[PDB]
Amino acid sequence: HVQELFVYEINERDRGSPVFLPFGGKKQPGTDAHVNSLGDLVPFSNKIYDGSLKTRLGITAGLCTLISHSDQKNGDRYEALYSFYFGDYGHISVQGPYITYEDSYLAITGGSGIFAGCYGQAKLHQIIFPFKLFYTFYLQGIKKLPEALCAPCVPPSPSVAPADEAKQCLPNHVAPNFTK
Amino acid sequence: HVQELFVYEINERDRGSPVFLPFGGKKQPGTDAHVNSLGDLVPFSNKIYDGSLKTRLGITAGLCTLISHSDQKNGDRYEALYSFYFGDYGHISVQGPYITYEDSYLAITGGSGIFAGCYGQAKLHQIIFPFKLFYTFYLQGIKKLPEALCAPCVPPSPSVAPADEAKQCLPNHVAPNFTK
Amino acid sequence: HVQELFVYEINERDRGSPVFLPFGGKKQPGTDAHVNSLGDLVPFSNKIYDGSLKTRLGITAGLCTLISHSDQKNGDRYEALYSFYFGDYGHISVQGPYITYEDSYLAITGGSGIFAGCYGQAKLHQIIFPFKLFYTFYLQGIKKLPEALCAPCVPPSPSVAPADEAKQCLPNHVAPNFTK
Numbered sequence A, B, C: 001h002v003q004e005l006f007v008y009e010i011n012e013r014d015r016g017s018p019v020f021l022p023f024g025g026k027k028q029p030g031t032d033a034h035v036n037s038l039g040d041l042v043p044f045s046n047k048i049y050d051g052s053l054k055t056r057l058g059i060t061a062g063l064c065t066l067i068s069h070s071d072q073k074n075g076d077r078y079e080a081l082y083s084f085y086f087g088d089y090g091h092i093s094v095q096g097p098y099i100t101y102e103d104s105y106l107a108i109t110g111g112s113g114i115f116a117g118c119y120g121q122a123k124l125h126q127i128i129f130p131f132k133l134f135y136t137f138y139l140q141g142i143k144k145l146p147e148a149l150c151a152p153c154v155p156p157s158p159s160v161a162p163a164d165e166a167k168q169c170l171p172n173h174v175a176p177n178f179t180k
């Protein structure tokens, strides 16, 4: 059966992330400005917190390949590969669409630790692109998640933020050996 | 229980794809022509059609890493990470080898929608280098595929082409909300 | 249940690997010398041998994204996407962390051939930085591994190396059509 795991991802502007590599080389007529296009590449790594926003869990880490830009939607389609690191709990890997202007479903490609052997899909919800994202992992194939990862979930909105104690990585507010 | 899904991938030269990034940095001694080498990178995105070639399904999107060039076999090994998008049906993600001179088998790393929880392997058969390819997904772990994705397959050959109405994306010749 | 597969990965310095692409753009204050940082990219391909070190099996191939550098730990975190090629046996794909100064667990994202439908996690253990690594794949979902892949394992240690006959790719010391 499916177990839902909720995760907040936030760019707290303190990891030098993301790195936008304009390799698509496309230029705007008249201005010669860069235009986002197939082949721009974007390494990145943000922080992740649990659904209650009270616990720092770890980080995301990976690489987005820009596929297309939409003027009508004011944003971009990327093809993404990245992992979520939850300290000693392990990691989950994902692959699939990252769309700046709408929600999408990524493949859960596997994991480690308590997530070893996991599979299924994960919903990516843009709360406020690019600083705040919210994931619902529909996890299959693994034992019952620990209660610490299943606290009542804060509903996402642009104003939500990690608890002070989680932002500060204090005792009682971090995953065991949370990923730095 | 394996279900076979046949897909045609066609580069219709309309997407600025592929983008060849010559980061391997190698040149041919005596001519200075580019030599394909480890570390050349190739973002890409092509169109996909169903096995009967009557329906536009969506796109591929991803990234190839060039691994080696064989002068003997007149081609290259790539390591490929990409997804297949089928509009509302969802997506399939793959990882593994693309060899420009022979068939290969890719890992199916998962999916979304009707493909959520999928696994197995997919045969990559090149029809024309590198503009036309034919895939056989040996899908495991999912519910019976919709009949619309299982129409009688056009046998692969160099001259095969999508139906005009599919190429033109006419309303009864496209997957539901087909991926653009 | 789980089947253990032991693999040695060796950079024998004959494949022009790795290719370090300094796209993170970070430089020392005065020297302008390279500082490893988020967004450096590293395409790579090494040789792989069986656990007994008597058989050349094939190669690894893929791409690492540098995520962070640690001065305190004197090393880097990468996010890795790569496959292991075992000649005619097939391939295994992996996704997850490579940390230059400690062991980690990768997701097994799938495979082909005898590895078709595989899942689970793989332990990455560094033998000697940067040239030798030792993997334990905890493979689920596949048929009993062939005896040739399950020979008594050489205990990992800094001094271990392939048998000369395996290094030279001689008869009796290669996988069927071992990947070159």
Ligand SMILES: CC/C=C\C[C@@H]1O[C@H]1C/C=C\CCCCCCCC(=O)O
Pocket (backbone or CB within 6 Å): B009, B017, B018, B019, B020, B042, B044, B045, B046, B060, B064, B078, B080, B098, B130, B133
């Ligand atoms: C992984 C195969 C799936 C689809 C085919 C990918 O579009 C092909 C890109 C992968 C390798 C490139 C093969 C050589 C073509 C490069 C032409 C250079 C250019 O004009 O951009």
